[PDB]
Design a protein around this ligand. Sequence first.
Ligand SMILES: NC(=O)c1ccc[n+]([C@@H]2O[C@H](COP(=O)([O-])OP(=O)(O)OC[C@H]3O[C@@H](n4cnc5c(N)ncnc54)[C@H](OP(=O)(O)O)[C@@H]3O)[C@@H](O)[C@H]2O)c1
Ligand SMILES: CCc1nc(N)nc(N)c1OCCCOc1ncccc1CCCO
Ligand SMILES: [Cl-]
Length: 166
Amino acid sequence: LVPRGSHMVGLIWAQATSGVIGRGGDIPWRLPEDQAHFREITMGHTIVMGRRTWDSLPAKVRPLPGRRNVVLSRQADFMASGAEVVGSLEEALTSPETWVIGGGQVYALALPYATRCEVTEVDIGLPREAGDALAPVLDETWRGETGEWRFSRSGLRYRLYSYHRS
Ligand SMILES: NC(=O)c1ccc[n+]([C@@H]2O[C@H](COP(=O)([O-])OP(=O)(O)OC[C@H]3O[C@@H](n4cnc5c(N)ncnc54)[C@H](OP(=O)(O)O)[C@@H]3O)[C@@H](O)[C@H]2O)c1
Ligand SMILES: CCc1nc(N)nc(N)c1OCCCOc1ncccc1CCCO
Ligand SMILES: [Cl-]
């Protein structure tokens, strides 16, 4: 359970087996099971994203509904209609439960404060290319639960990981 006076920080992302999470300002696959899972985890909570992740969402769908949207930017004139723009993680992480929803820069930034990661791994062969956004690497202070491989309606294998630390 999450006490209302704490500040729990989780990370949630979907990656190829190579660790790629983003390419060319988008996610280089689509997996309905993953979007359903992302909604199930994050709904009702604050979500924190980097400015480039906000940019990657079509204007008509953002801010993502059912969640307090917070965007990280260092640009004093960047504005996110419907959402709050802050310049640091300290400003972004004031809710009792916060999910950092990407992208590569902000995962790495937020990991020192996080105690949970929820990962979808997609069994698509997407090798790392220069410029890609990548999943954060987790050191030995993390302990993980790896699900068995499942099969999506769209014909891709995928599996879920849950990582925790104190
Ligand atoms: N597969 C997934 O789970 C997943 C999830 C989310 C996103 N993505 C993909 O990942 C890519 C985006 O990731 P990215 O690494 O390029 O960018 P990002 O992490 O989404 O955003 C980077 C931006 O965040 C701001 N920022 C970074 N560090 C900051 C700090 N310390 N304080 C304040 N603001 C800070 C800066 O905005 P300013 O430049 O405005 O200062 C920076 O340009 C896209 O391809 C997207 O589609 C994938
Ligand atoms: C669903 C992708 C995802 N999956 C996991 N597991 N964790 C994340 N943090 C994550 O990204 C959430 C922010 C990027 O959302 C998208 N980006 C590109 C296309 C579609 C979407 C879905 C919102 C628009 O309907
Ligand atoms: Cl969503």
